[PDB]
């Protein structure tokens, strides 16, 4: 039986078997849903989480449990992506991590927050500035269908 | 209800809960529409508004309310896109913001104005320059279908 | 100029120069828009109007003028689509005609009303039955993006 | 505040202003979510409902609230679709109605339950039999990507 | 030096080397342009011409010359497709022939006329009724871009 | 845990709560894999299962395990599809069922096996005759 | 050394291992080229080939070789496609076979000749006739790019 | 009635109400058509014009009429693009402007001429040099389909 | 007989015939499958592999065989992809190589681990670092179907 | 028609009426075909030609014939691209030029040859050095 109340402590990690190398690992999460803060009205999003690990790697079952812990939680989309990133940063202490959320529209408008991070003072911080400044140089076509 | 002539007063905002890191928040607005100043004939576009927030963030519903205010308003597409950015800039005081509108053609011709901005004298101004200089390097294929 | 409340009087037509053979003439109308009866909020759709003419054919510009007349008019999508067909039917007296509208979602739900008609008692009535019975057998994938 | 417990009683309807003709009305519902009856695990699907109205018509907002009521309600997917069709049949007494759920996979296996109904003994009963014998003759490619 | 004044006599044919067999042959003509009758305003279309031949086959250079003969000719789209079909019928006396034109929009609306023919009293006449009644059972998505 | 030996006894059904109407239920199964009839080399397919239930319905997880058990099992194609179809018939005894497997082409050869069943003495048996007839005009 | 004069004597056959069944074997030649018989000018196409064998199968390497023997042969496209089907028919005595060719444009017009066959008297014959009747209902979009 | 003879003098402009910032304005022109100087054969292309405005802005309808003036005007494609850029530079005196033609093939060969310009000695001259050194580093796949 | 216990001793190499050049050789395994080390449960993916050789090349048949030796091996996806790259690195001593894996979802989450390498000290090393920094900027849309 | 023997003498240029500015001109050529270096088997490619003219420009039809002449000609790849590039240099003597050929993979091997030239002693020679550097980070 799962908690639909925000619960960061469900997250787990496992050791990295290839530390001495930089690789990407993406999590496609098309089943994310949470609630709006004022109304309690359900919101929906596909979330892409890509990160380069150091020692600790996020185990996907826990990711799933952590993503399920937002079902009854009423927060804004931009906050949501950012909270998702902070807890993952604290969990793994990764070299680089990015969170890209794509929500379904409300009142004809859809919100896609994009946030990232690079271990401070290193070249991943530089990459994060790079991916950020070159972010969505060509936004994808959307027509709400 | 719904005003249908320019009304930037309807825009509202909320505190940025993650002020200490840069992140993009994009609004896909494919249901936008307004009028042509002289003829009165209507036009339609999809507008992408990406921005890196400082301390204030535009409230979604109010953004919707703001774009409906152009339904009975006559303006050019270029003007229109700059007007939008101005009254987001003034509302939020963002680190960076850009507005890319893609209009449906008249006389077989589509107009896609793109404009952007970064706080004067900060690294966001260099970004605004970068993203503008490298803007639409590979234009997308249009056949008007 | 441009009236923005129901005005079916603006529809015009011209003689069918090829009365002696059946052929479809489709109007892709992706710039359609109107209001919701109670709220006043606006909605958008793409409307496909295919028809087999008899002796009269709707004049394109007037069709445009007719669809602009729904810009400030409150109605439901289903009603709206039937109203359109009625005042094409009455204008042209076609052998067959159908109206398929595809609306942008509200509360996460899109409404695609489809309606059709063939002259009472002719083979076009069998067509109307066929095309309705076999209509949208394989619905298209919608994700609201 | 809402509630996410099965609530068929929240559905509303309005008179069909166009009773004298047959036409289809489809609802694309990509945000459907409910629970597995045992585990308690959330599940997701895209639901397409298409019906031919008699005298009543489901009001989309009521359907919205109705579909949300499944959010914290457990049940297998095949029942789920039947339940949705029954509730609409009682609400509207349609000439015809079909429901096609497309669920996301569990264990790399996805279930797409299709149900339909014709007003008993009328010619729609035969349509239901036709659309069921001819249902999904050429199924879509699914790889779970 | 080519005539841009309607000229059907430019068309040529060659004998069929495989009469005793039914095969399709499609001509994709994305470079078609003509003028509007009232204004002289240029119009544009991609035209697909598919036909099953008998004895005579249309030589493509002549098709090209015939399609170029419309550049200064001011006719309506529906007429245009139909005239294109009649002259091809007279030229070849084919078993079956279809003409599908797709024009670029004017005033936000695009017109796609579809017309066909089967040698009268034969099974191709039946096919023509078939392709007609099953015509565009799923119109393609259009948004004027 | 898991059995990779053919294991039809893993299948499990639950009762159908709606028997007055005919409705389809499709299972998309794109992770099917087994061992080929001779070489011993693996083969892969997406298996599309559609059926009109009668009184019994197949539980998804049970089905998932059932299909895995074919992982280290060796038998020809057509057999492989009917094996499945038949176990599903013996499990549910439905009105109609059809199993279509699309193997990743090994020669220039598709090999997409299509079988179906209609309950004998019924209209479903004519439907099976009907779909099978339409299936091959276009796979 | 190679043969670039039309040479069907190159085709080899082998056993169908699946004589009991009806499976389509598909070949796909993306770079076929011959010559215009009128001038000596080269032409180019993609050739799609599908057939259900009986006893025989064409060994695909001799098919590629066979297709290269057109490099210096003058013939029209319609003729060309039909010739390839005949030579395959004579080599294999297939149950069913079809050849769909897609040529690059010349004079801004591209020719796609489609031809098929089903053993006479069999259901394959009838299978081929259903296919000519429903061949390419929705032609793909071509813009010559 | 129009005329289709080279007419640069038909271009109009309006003051740029937003002089104090840099922004791009692109025109997608898919209906461009003109003539080959010798043969007299029509030719077609999709033209993308993007410019950064200083004090003037081209009026889209004037550009429409301007682009139509090439309809019965002969010229190679590389000149054609230069001519269009020059005429716009004189009209507007832009900070920056680039023009990219994409022509349909002749002899299976298509020419895509790209031209640009920076206000002399200003920093746009350097932008032009940047967008020219970096122009088309990863060219699109073209097969003439 | 086959090997379904992890067996890298299966890989064979051969000569690069193009030692002077830098060409990517691509392999594409659409049906890879292993096992979860946690439970014994099977997992599935498509494996993309690209590498620039030096002296050696992997004989592709032993690559397929090598990939099938994972059928019964327990390991996570990140680990798995990295192992394949290592074994290829040791066999070929490539100039550059990357492995991009795409797993089917489990718990409604799919894992795509991407990893690469460029000979240390060379430009290939730097080539690999540019790629990690610009890897998958726009993630493809995933909806689990 | 037509010559299918290598025939560089078929190339023809016309003067450039705009020499004060640098502009690119690209020729998309997806119907290139020639005979391979050994077997004698044909090979096919789409050839992308981009160049900044100086004073001379290549006439399209002349180019079309030029490329056909490679139809019954035998020579290796890299050679084949430079042959083209060089004849184009000798024809136009442009500021910059690059020829990229994308052959339909014969092994699992692309073979996409990329060459370019910048006029020596100029900034174009640095641009050639620049593009060539960026080309291979992603073909
Ligand atoms: N839930 C919710 C929201 C309601 N208004 C919002 N506005 C913004 N910008 N973001 C949000 O996430 C929401
Ligand atoms: N309405 C209108 C317009 C007419 N000419 C225009 N030209 C430009 N650049 N923009 C516009 O919005 C319009
Ligand atoms: N506006 C509005 C609507 C609110 N409920 C609705 N229900 C239906 N079926 N249609 C509609 O157009 C609307
Ligand atoms: N939830 C859930 C389920 C678990 N097994 C199932 N089996 C079937 N046929 N359907 C279902 O919805 C489920
Ligand atoms: N040209 C032109 C036309 C102007 N109005 C039109 N209306 C229709 N229905 N068709 C047409 O081709 C035209
Ligand atoms: N080559 C060539 C041709 C020149 N005119 C043609 N006309 C047709 N229908 N087909 C062709 O192949 C050719
Ligand atoms: N029209 C025409 C042409 C004929 N040869 C050409 N060569 C070039 N480079 N450009 C052109 O536009 C033409
Ligand atoms: N199998 C398996 C797994 C279970 N949790 C996992 N978490 C991660 N990051 N990767 C994996 O492969 C798995
Ligand atoms: Ca939320
Ligand atoms: Ca969409
Ligand atoms: Ca406007
Ligand atoms: Ca388009
Ligand atoms: Ca309405
Ligand atoms: Ca979509
Ligand atoms: Ca459920
Ligand atoms: Ca898929
Ligand atoms: Ca016309
Ligand atoms: Ca479009
Ligand atoms: Ca030929
Ligand atoms: Ca194309
Ligand atoms: Ca020209
Ligand atoms: Ca193409
Ligand atoms: Ca594994
Ligand atoms: Ca998908």
From Swiss-Prot, chains A, B, C, D, E, G, H, I:
Pfam family, one: QueF
Keyword Oxidoreductase: yes
Subunit-level organization: Forms an asymmetric tunnel-fold homodecamer of two head-to-head facing pentamers, harboring 10 active sites at the intersubunit interfaces.
Molecular functions per Gene Ontology: metal ion binding; preQ1 synthase activity
The keyword Calcium appears for this protein: yes
Record's catalysed reaction(s): 7-aminomethyl-7-carbaguanine + 2 NADP(+) = 7-cyano-7-deazaguanine + 2 NADPH + 3 H(+)
Organism lineage string: Bacteria, Bacillati, Bacillota, Bacilli, Bacillales
pH dependence: Optimum pH is 7.5.
Family (UniProt): Belongs to the GTP cyclohydrolase I family. QueF type 1 subfamily.
General function of this protein: Catalyzes the NADPH-dependent reduction of 7-cyano-7-deazaguanine (preQ0) to 7-aminomethyl-7-deazaguanine (preQ1), a late step in the queuosine pathway.
Active site positions: 36, 43
Activity modulation comment: Activity is strongly inhibited by Cu(2+) and Fe(3+).
Domain of life: Bacteria
Name under which the protein is recorded: NADPH-dependent 7-cyano-7-deazaguanine reductase
InterPro entries attached to this UniProt entry: GTP-CH-I_C/QueF (IPR043133), NADPH_dep_7-cyano-7-deazaG_red (IPR050084), QueF (IPR029500), QueF_type1 (IPR016856)
Note describing how the cofactor binds: Does not require a metal cofactor.
UniProt pathway: tRNA modification; tRNA-queuosine biosynthesis
Compartment(s): Cytoplasm
A biological process term (GO) from this entry: queuosine biosynthetic process
Organism, as annotated: Bacillus subtilis (strain 168)
Residues annotated to bind substrate: 58-60, 77-78
Cystine connections: none
EC numbers for this chain: 1.7.1.13
Residues given in the record as Mg(2+) binding sites: 143, 145
Keyword terms of this UniProt record: Calcium, Cytoplasm, Magnesium, Metal-binding, NADP, Oxidoreductase, Queuosine biosynthesis
One GO CC term on file: cytosol
């Amino acid at each position: 039986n799962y908690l639909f109340e925000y619960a960061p402590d469900v997250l787990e990690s496992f050791p990295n078997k290839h530390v001495n190398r930089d690789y990407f690992v993406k999590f496609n999460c098309p089943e994310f849903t949470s609630l709006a803060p004022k109304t309690g009205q359900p919101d929906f999003a596909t979330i892409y989480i890509s990160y380069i690990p150091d020692e600790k790697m996020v185990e996907s079952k826990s990711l799933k449990l952590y993503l399920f812990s937002f079902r009854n939680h009423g927060d804004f989309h931009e906050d949501c992506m950012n909270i998702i990133m902070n807890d993952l940063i604290e969990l793994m202490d990764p070299r680089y991590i990015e969170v890209w959320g794509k929500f379904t529209p409300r009142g004809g408008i859809s919100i896609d927050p994009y946030t990232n991070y690079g271990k401070p003072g290193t070249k991943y911080e530089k990459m994060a500035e790079y991916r950020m400044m070159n972010h969505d140089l060509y936004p994808e076509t959307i027509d709400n269908r």
